[PDB]
Amino acid sequence: ANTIKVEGYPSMEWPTSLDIPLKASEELVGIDLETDLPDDPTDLKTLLVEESSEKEHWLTIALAYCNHGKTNEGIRLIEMALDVFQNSERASLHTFLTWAHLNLAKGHSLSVETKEHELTQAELNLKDAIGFDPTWIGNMLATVELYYQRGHYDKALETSDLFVKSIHAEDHRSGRQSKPNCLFLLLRAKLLYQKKNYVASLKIFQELLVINPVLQPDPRIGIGLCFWQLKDPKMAIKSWQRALQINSKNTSASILVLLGEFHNSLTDSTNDEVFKETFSKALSDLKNIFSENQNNPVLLTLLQTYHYFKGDFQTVLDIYHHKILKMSPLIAKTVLSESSFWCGRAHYALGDYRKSFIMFQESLKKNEDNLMARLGLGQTQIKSNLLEESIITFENLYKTNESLQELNYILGLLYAGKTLDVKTSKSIPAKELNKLNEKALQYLERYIKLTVAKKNQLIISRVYLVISQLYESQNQYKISLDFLSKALEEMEFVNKDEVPLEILNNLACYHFINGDLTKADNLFEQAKAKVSDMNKSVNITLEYNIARTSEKTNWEKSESIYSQITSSHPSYISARIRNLYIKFAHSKINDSEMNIEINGLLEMNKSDLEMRSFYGWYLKNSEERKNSEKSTSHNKETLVKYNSHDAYALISLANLYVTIARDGKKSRNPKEQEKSKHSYLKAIQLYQKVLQIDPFNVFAAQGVAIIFAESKRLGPALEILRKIRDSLDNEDVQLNLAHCLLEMREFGKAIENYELVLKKFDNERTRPHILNLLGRAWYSRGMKERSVSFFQKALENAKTALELFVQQSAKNKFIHSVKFNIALLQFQIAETLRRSNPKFRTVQQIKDSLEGLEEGLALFKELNDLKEFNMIPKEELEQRIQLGETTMKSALERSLNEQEEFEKDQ
Amino acid sequence: SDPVLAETMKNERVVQDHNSALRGARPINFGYLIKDAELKLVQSIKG
Amino acid sequence: SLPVPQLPPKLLAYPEAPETNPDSSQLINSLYVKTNISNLIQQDEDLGMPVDLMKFPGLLNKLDSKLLYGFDNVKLDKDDRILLRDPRIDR
Amino acid sequence: LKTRTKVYYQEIQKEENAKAKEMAQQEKLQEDRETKERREKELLLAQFRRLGGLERMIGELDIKFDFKF
């Protein structure tokens, strides 16, 4: 039953029968000690005193009583034997009683007082037996074991070492060989295990296995224990399973095999079905084993675990407070520590953080290496608004858990929360805040790596969100978008149905600043698909986002969404600012309704910097609005010192105050030239400050730029313009490139960038005026007299600019000089063809030139008759009239029907 | 006033300021131009 | 020159996700999966190995301590011999 | 110290160490078929190995005890 039984191995089973001799000398009175043992041992006492039987029969019957659960009966029997066997024959009786009371002190469902009483009686009978036979092995073994049962492990080890020394010495003196005593080896093994010497313990336990493979207590238990502590759980479980298989009644082995079942279900299962199967089997075995060991603290702690995960927190507390707490002094510190830990988890789940703190502390007090409990204490400190204390707890844990993934996650999130708090940014220098940021990134990135290493574990995708948020704070949006997309790809994998609309929207926002507006609109609208439940304030933002991607393809929907948004809610400035730009881009309006509604907008939130930048753009764009003299005061008041150290309106003021200085330099009076020598250095006295505040501001760079095309230092300048092209696709910067270019410059590089302005865009005011004025390229090109086809290219330029400006007669009061430009190159095709050689291709060519010449005469007439014309002196009007017209009337006919004769000659 | 606009007021963050999108798309540092200026500045305008 | 005042689409903040907060007990649970019952394998201070001198016939009754010294020449089964190997030898 | 049992223990220990070391070294080849990928993804997606999953999977277990504490 309760002994190890293995085929081929030895046995340690007691004899099952016993004869007693009689003085009548009939050699038998058989007692089957499995059956014929009376429930009252006095009934046998009468037989044993009747026959004057030998002591060993008393002891044999008492041991059969003990090896049947009736230890009290055997005790009373030897206690009755003690009233009979006087003197030295008492020794063995005291030895038996010492071991019987040790056995009783090893019993379940004991009290502190019962256990102490049994140990005291053990020590008393051992004192007596030592008084008789101080050298018997039973008494020495009882000495060591009593020392062990009272927690005096060092003393027990030293005593047993001295006993073993004594035995080897006595054997060596008389020639006997010393065989290893299994019980001394087993005690030394358990003691070394208590001293955390797992290698030595394991060796002794394995050699015990060899010496006596059926030894009870099974050394395979100790073997498994050492394997486990040495981080070999598979071999540990194999050992415990073997112990159970060779003695199915070994309860310790059954509990250990049960723990192994829980462990293997948690760590070996590859899917939820296998997990639920194996875990259900473990819970079933737990129920079966518990039904017969209801005072077992390991089983009760397993129940605390199951009822925690089952949500039944009240039962966790009940198990702790009604079962474990009462037997507290009688259970091992590590088991009690785990039980307290689960009770603290229960309090934590109920929101009772004071009690959870107390419980995790009590858990650590009985096992300070309880890692779970220390993490629970850290988290309780978090919940208790003790953030710095929690960080200290976690970093102290980190000292010896550098590779724990959950710890890296927790420390990373705590440092990330610190880095992103505004209060900390207001109280520590920037360098310290940046080092805090990188420490957060270190923790989070090492968590990522540790989880990626075990390539079978799933990353908590919030880590990617947090890393994205950390990089967003320091204005590195490439890596930010990268980590946000990595977050969503991990997040759609796990429950694709419910990913937060926030991640889709914010990826769309990051794509808007990149350039892909169709994908931005796409994901913006997959996010409008999944908007929230109550007070859906997310629609206002989502609709504005879609309405702001819809501005340059299908701005009718910009119209619609902006209008309904501003009609529904009034304070949204960012809506109708852009709406009053969709206004401008399509001019479905009276300028007066504009100034009315904005100059209502102005003062409702005066200190909003954005609408200030909109009324700066209000008075400086395509049609008219010439003065804005008060705009000096406008954009100096936008700053005006309330919120100084800001760039936009500042560089607007810059641009105006540098525009003043060109008109300053146009004058012949030295006083205003010296005055423009102030409107020019105000530029570099403020542009320096705004490049100091933000170097990468592109437009300060064009500030400097427009100085050099104006101050004749262009060589250095078109360098900067070639760079700001890399960092801008504004038509202004690149037509200024071709501005600074056109001067002191062959042609190829000019027409290049002026057809790049051509095709970059389709705008309708810049285009006509600018390429009007810079057909000039082919014009001066032709002042070098290249060829005739480029003359007619300049004709193309002129021609289209003319038809544009005359048909665009909404604002066309600037161009009579242009008219003369075209008339002038009619004149200049001829004047080039006047010095010529007959051997040119002639048919159908310069006919058109003389036609254009007469057209230019007709054009000259109109400007002759006008009085507002102050381009050339009126005397010189009539004088270019007479000179160029007495030459053409006596020269162009000359050339024409001179070349007709060469057409005859060809 | 109306608090339906209030939730929106506190849940939306500024992707790029008005003073911070004045920088193009692949920004280049122009910190060389401070000293370039105060050299060419002073070498040019002496009255 | 100058551009139009830009008000790009607005980023939203994320809703609170307590299950991934640092105070989330789910982190403790994920650790429990890996290190579960480890602190229970030692059941009591006897290490689940009670020394009982009443398992050795002849010892307490006849004062024959022979069985304390084991047996000679036992050949162990396969299932018992593999338990003799050194720990963590699977590298 | 050359008892039969110390020599026997040490011989078996050497043999079992050799065998276990060699098996550990060959663990990669034995059954890393195409199936390594099947099992890795099956493991990844076990709900019990992800946040909140242990409780979910344990919650789905019919079994429970007649606690009378």
Numbering used by the authors:
A (entry chain C): 2 to 907
B (entry chain A): 163 to 209
C (entry chain P): 16 to 106
D (entry chain R): 502 to 570
Sentences copied from the publication:
The polymerase-associated factor 1 complex (PAF1C) is one of the most important transcription elongation factors that positively regulates genome-wide gene expression. In simple eukaryotes such as budding yeast, PAF1C contains five subunits: Paf1, Ctr9, Cdc73, Leo1 and Rtf1. PAF1C can regulate transcription through direct association with the polymerase or by impacting the chromatin structure epigenetically. The largest component, Ctr9, forms the backbone and shapes the overall architecture of the complex, while the other components join the complex mainly through associations with Ctr9.
We found that PAF1C from the yeast Saccharomyces eubayanus, which showed 86% sequence identity from that of budding yeast, could be purified and produce better crystals. We then optimized the crystals of the complex of Ctr9-Paf1-Cdc73-Rtf1 from Saccharomyces eubayanus and solved the structure at the resolution of 2.7 Å. The overall architecture of the Ctr9-Paf1-Cdc73-Rtf1 quaternary complex from Saccharomyces eubayanus was shown to be similar as to those from the thermophilic fungus and from humans. The major body of Ctr9 folds into 21 tetratricopeptide repeats (TPRs) that wrap around the N-terminus of Paf1 to form a three-circled right-handed solenoid structure, with the Paf1 N-terminus just filling in the central tunnel of the Ctr9 solenoid. To facilitate crystallization, the C-terminal long α helix was truncated. Paf1 residues 9–105 can be traced in the Ctr9-Paf1-Cdc73-Rtf1 quaternary complex. Cdc73 joins PAF1C mainly through its middle region, which contains two helices connected by loops, and contacts Ctr9 spanning a region containing the lower part of the middle turn and the upper part of the C-terminal turn. The overall structure of Rtf1 (residues 502 to 570) in the quaternary complex has the shape of a twisted letter “U” that contains three α helices connected by loops. In our study, we observed that helix α1 of Rtf1 actually interacts with a new surface made of Ctr9 and Paf1. With this additional binding surface, the total contact surfaces between Rtf1 and the PAF1C core subunits from Saccharomyces eubayanus reached to 3025 Å2, which is much larger than the corresponding contact surfaces from Saccharomyces cerevisiae or Komagataella phaffii, which are 1754 Å2 or 1509 Å2, respectively.
